[PDB]
From a paper:
We reasoned that to enable systematic design of binders to convex protein target sites it would be necessary to generate scaffold sets with overall concave shapes. We focused on 5 helix bundle scaffolds with three helices forming the concave interface and two helices providing structural support. The selected 7476 scaffolds, which we refer to as 5HCS (5 helix concave scaffolds) throughout the remainder of the text, have a wide range of curvatures. Our method for computationally designing small but concave proteins to bind to convex protein target sites expands the space of the protein surfaces that can be targeted by de novo protein design.
Immunoglobulin domain recognition plays important roles in immune receptor functions; in particular the cancer immunotherapy targets Cytotoxic--T--lymphocyte--antigen--4 (CTLA-4) have extracellular Ig fold domains that are the targets of therapeutic antibodies. The highest affinity optimized binder, 5HCS_CTLA4_1 has a sequence similarity of 82.86% compared to 5HCS_CTLA4_0. 5HCS_CTLA4_1 had an off rate too slow and a binding affinity for CTLA-4 too tight (<100 pM) to be measurable by biolayer interferometry. We determined co-crystal structures of 5HCS_CTLA4_1 with CTLA-4 and unbound crystal structures of 5HCS_CTLA4_2. The design model of 5HCS_CTLA4_1 in complex with CTLA-4 also closely agrees with the crystal structure, with a very low rmsd of 0.34 Å. 5HCS_CTLA4_1 binds to the CD86 binding site on CTLA-4 using a concave binding surface formed by H1, H3 and H5 covering both the CTLA-4 beta-turn (L98 to Y104) and hydrophobic pocket which interacts with CD86. H1 interacts with the hydrophobic beta-turn (L128 to Y136) through hydrophobic interactions between Y18 and M135 and aromatic interactions between H19 and Y136. S54 and I55 on H3 interact with Y139 on CTLA-4, and N89 on H5 hydrogen bonds with Q90 on CTLA-4. We co-cultured the cells with a range of concentrations of the CTLA–4 binder, and observed dose-dependent activation of CTLA-4 effector cells with an EC50 of 53.3 nM.
Residue numbers in the entry:
A (entry chain B): 3 to 117
B (entry chain A): 2 to 105
Write the structure that this text describes.
Amino acid sequence: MHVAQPAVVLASSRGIASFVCEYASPGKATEVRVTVLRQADSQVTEVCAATYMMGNELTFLDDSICTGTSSGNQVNLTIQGLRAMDTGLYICKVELMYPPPYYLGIGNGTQIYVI
Amino acid sequence: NLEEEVHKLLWELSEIYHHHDHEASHEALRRALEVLKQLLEHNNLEQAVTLVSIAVHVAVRVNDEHVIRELRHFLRRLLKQVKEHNNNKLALLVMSVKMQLDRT
């Protein structure tokens, strides 16, 4: 499954980054699980993860660092509390959990830059 | 036809996950292991990464330590093969599955 996100994003003067992650949802799915992974430089960590219903706000597991809203086949994620160290490639993994079948899609990642 | 076997399992494991179904998981997971095993031998990693991903989701919730242990070993071979084809997406894909599997 195709997932699209901006190539580069700049953190505001207060390290809050916002980017939209769009998934080619096969028709219409109900249970979507979005995971944001950070790759920097060869180091891979899970920044946040949330399972939400296609059109609602995002109920995050960590309920910190990440906030999000969903609108159709796209989700706008907002990451707070960013320092310069947190600069890296923020990649969107999107899973369609329900109704069956399961689907999986990864973006090519958003380069976020923090000052 | 393996391609269909994955197609059934991706349907079945999604219904099992949503349905929280403890012993439909057992046999579906065992079938998943072998289908995943066959996918590794024939270097069809895109099915393998999708199948193992949802399979790990079912494994952790149902708590089959046998399947988890077997999946700990398959994930390591799967990652290795992905790295050798330099497919970074698939590697990120496998590693994120490794992370949740590694410690839950």
